[PDB]
């Protein structure tokens, strides 16, 4: 046969992300002396929409500690954050919505978002709209913190990893049906070229492993092992179980 | 209960003197034939003196201590009164309703105000009045 659709996406010719209208990468501040010792105050100048992202973004301006100028940061806004609000980031920050604190400086049960996997990577966890991380325990020895992830997995993270108090704004977006093909078209127009999708059983054998036959059927089990090679991994990959 | 008197220090809010510190000389609570509103006669600073250090020479110190005054009639709503005071008896008489409506008389009055301010700045007192507001 020929190269199947899911193999062609790795070349990245027509499947790259559409990033013309993006506001910029959403990251926390670089962990510096002020963050790890005290705190620094920032001001929210505006809250803006970002193309291809459900959650809104907040523009926060800080003063440069070592030079006379202003530094602008792009944060993912939490619910309740408004323009003109003072934002405090650092070890000695208060427990308020929008403040950036390390996970070792908050009590159990605190709701946080934009959580660093490791101290200094500037946010990796709980970034989509409506998602958050729950603090469930601390290990003062060896400096570890136990957290609960949006998928339900339990992870152990260093207590020096930073997080933003609150929950990502824009929740409830997926509860409204798209209701027609046009709305789906404009949604993926700002993300990437993955829509529409043609079913493999509707193709020819040269095109897809599900293709061909005088009837439209798969013909073999759709559960595919983890050890299969590229060109075979079509269907349900390493499925522990199927059905409703 | 009344604080707008003839020695109160206020901050100008509008009119090419916004952000300049001023002192009230003669207040008029109930209007006048002109300016039918609550207003006061004030004398302020147009150009604050520069900071002086020990390294400056005699000729440079005298140049950096110059003060440019001004006289203005200001509405009450365009003033922000403070808790500071400054006696105006040295130039209370020269600044009045008559010193206006005459280009030549205004210049003579401002020369008297400049002498009082410069002597006030020397032997430093009323330091808050001679410090420019940052905004």
């Amino acid at each position: 046969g020929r190269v199947i659709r899911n193999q062609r996406k790795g070349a990245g010719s027509i499947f790259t992300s559409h990033t013309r209208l993006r506001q910029g990468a959403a990251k926390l501040r670089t962990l510096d002396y002020a963050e790890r010792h005290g705190y620094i105050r920032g001001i929210v100048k505006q809250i803006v929409h970002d193309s291809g992202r459900g959650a809104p973004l907040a523009k926060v301006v800080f003063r440069d500690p070592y030079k006379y100028r202003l530094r602008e940061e792009i944060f993912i806004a939490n619910e309740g954050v408004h323009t003109g609000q003072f934002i405090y980031a650092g070890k000695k920050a208060s427990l308020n919505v929008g403040n950036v604190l390390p996970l070792g400086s908050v009590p159990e049960g605190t709701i946080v978002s934009n959580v660093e996997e490791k101290p200094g990577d500037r946010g990796a966890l709980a970034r989509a709209s409506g998602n958050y991380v729950i603090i469930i325990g601390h290990n003062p020895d060896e400096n570890k913190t136990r957290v609960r992830l949006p998928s339900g997995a339990k992870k152990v993270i260093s207590s020096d990893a930073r997080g933003v108090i609150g929950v990502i704004a824009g929740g409830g977006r997926v509860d409204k049906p798209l209701l027609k093909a046009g709305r789906a078209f404009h949604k993926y127009r700002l993300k990437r070229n993955s829509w529409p999708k043609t079913r493999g059983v509707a193709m020819n054998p040269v095109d897809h492993p599900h293709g061909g036959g005088n009837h439209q059927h798969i013909g073999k089990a759709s559960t595919i092992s983890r050890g299969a090679v590229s060109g075979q991994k079509a269907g349900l990959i390493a499925a522990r179980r199927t059905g409703l | 209960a009344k604080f707008l008197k003839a020695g109160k220090v206020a901050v100008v809010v509008r009119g090419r003197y916004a952000g300049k510190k001023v002192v009230i000389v003669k207040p008029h609570d109930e209007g006048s034939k002109s300016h039918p509103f609550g207003h006061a006669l004030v004398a302020g600073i147009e150009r604050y003196p520069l900071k002086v250090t020990k390294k400056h020479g005699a000729k440079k110190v005298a140049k950096r201590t110059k003060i440019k005054p001004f006289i203005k009639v200001v509405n009450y709503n365009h003033l922000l009164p403070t808790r500071y005071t400054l006696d105006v008896e040295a130039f209370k008489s020269v600044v009045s309703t008559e010193t206006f409506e005459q280009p030549s008389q205004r210049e003579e009055a401002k020369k008297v105000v400049k002498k009082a301010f410069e002597e006030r700045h020397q032997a430093g007192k009323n330091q808050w009045f001679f410090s420019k507001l940052r905004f």
């Binding site: 010792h37 005290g38 705190y39 105050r41 440069d64 500690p65 070592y66 | 430093g124």
Partner: peptide
């Protein structure tokens, strides 16, 4: 004497910009 004033700078976290210090330890050689 009456023209010069003492205006100490606060070099704490979040205060005035830090002054120039010796950074020879941190130089990228």
């Amino acid at each position: 004497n009456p023209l010069t004033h003492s205006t100490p700078k606060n070099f704490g976290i979040g205060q005035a910009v830090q002054p120039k210090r010796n950074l020879s330890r941190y130089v990228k050689w």
